[PDB]
């Protein structure tokens with residue numbers, strides 16, 4: 001796959017200092033009649049939901065076989081009495097009574113910068129297995145049910161990729177005169193103030209809850225969530241945290257539930273019209289009614305002003321074409337199916353997806369980025385022509401087609417069988433996923449260009465490699481041939497007709513976000 005094996009680098013703890021100074025800064029919020037009004041409507045909805053506690057066992061089953069006092073995930077999962085009793089002893093320590101966490105640096109694989117420069121590692125912050133399991137018993141059923149109730153269609157994790165595109169496209173198509181933009185808040189977790197976290201608590205507490213549930217949430221909120229001590233791998237003090245911890249069950253929830261309240265309110269201060277938000281973590285997209293180009297521009301510096309006092313990285317750009325808006329590193333693009341009929345789909349710059357694919361050939365990994373990406377980007381031309389080709393060839397060589405693999409989707413861990421990709425993709429994207437062609441020159445160029453930049457063979461070659469793989473999958477039959485038939489129809493001159501798959505007939509997959517949670521489904 002990759003030749004320029006030098007621009008591909010992972011982030012280590014050497015660069016922690018860098019990330020600490022990008023992460024350390026004082027916070028100062030102001031509230032408005034807007035802010036508050038959002039809040040009241042929120043709680044109005046929040047107080048609508050009956051939430052229930054998870055038994056120690058249910059919390060145990062939700063722990064990943066390889067997640068991080070004397071026991072491990074395996075022990076937790078088997079319901080080991082050493083494990084279950086130690087957990088009971090934090091749960092009770094929790095109903096009767098600041099908690100410690102671990103601060104670590106993340107090792108993610110990127111590629112050297114545009115125009116040079118290597119991004120500093122991200123800082124992970126998680127209690128230990130025992131705490132984590134208590135987080136689920138108390139909150140899990142809340143971070144799995146609140147956002148959608150409070151934020152309605154605005155909550156992003158409720159969507160599969162195909163559903164996101166649809167919502168984005170129809171939302172855009174419904175404005176008489178649409179204007180939109182993305183807004184990335186600088187180190188959102190670091191901008192989360194203690195007050196936000198309590199407000200959060202408040203909304204959690206708005207829910208029809210279990211007596212101890214509330215007791216446990218409050219404890220967690222004050223003991224674990226508003227902040228606390230920070231310990232490194234060795235065992236020394238690295239400090240204290242007064243904002244959002246990244247590796248706790250509620251982190252995704254809080255950010256989405258928070259970013260929403262700030263933007264939603266800042267959209268009232270900016271006086272921008274029929275504001276529709278798509279929120280997931282700290283990434284926000286807004287599609288509203290244009291008030292005119294210059295009024296829009298002016299109107300957007302006010303949205304910025306208001307976010308700040310409740311900041312951005314790059315200043316937000318007003319946009320009048322949906323494909324031009326970028327969020328989650330993704331942008332909508334269009335192609336045509338087997339009838340020339342236009343199909344919109346989500347795509348992204350393919351550098352990180354390919355870079356981590358390269359890193360995945362060198363060292364087999366804990367989490368298969370390649371598969372996830374195939375699943376989330378099945379309709380894109382780079383994911384079909386390169387990723388599916390490259391990895392099915394590998395699965396063929398090492399004879400691993402049948403081995404299920406651990407895939408992460410929206411921070412949640414899943415067990416997926418490669419041979420199931422056909423059915424899955426039919427579900428998350430529709431049959432068009434297997435007939436898309438006539439991609440945008442722009443899209444084609446970013447891809448064609450990224451291939452040079454990284455030094456991976458050109459598309460024409462992948463097409464041949466695919467004709468070969470396709471052939472070998474067809475020769476083995478069953479699910480594999482179907483993988484050959486459906487996944488590589490794009491690679492042959494005379495296409496075969498792709499009828500809807502029988503076995504294509506995937507809910508838990510897009511309900512909520514669990515980033516930095518410890519979820520296994």
Ligand SMILES: CC(=O)c1cc(F)c(Cl)cc1NCC(=O)Nc1ccccc1C(=O)O
Pocket residue numbers: 156157159160161162164280328329330346348369372373376377408409410411
């Ligand atoms: C919510 C979000 O970030 C997202 C939603 C989508 F609808 C699509 Cl298309 C892409 C997204 N993010 C960029 C990305 O690269 N995501 C992933 C890639 C592989 C496996 C999992 C994810 C993930 O976002 O969980």
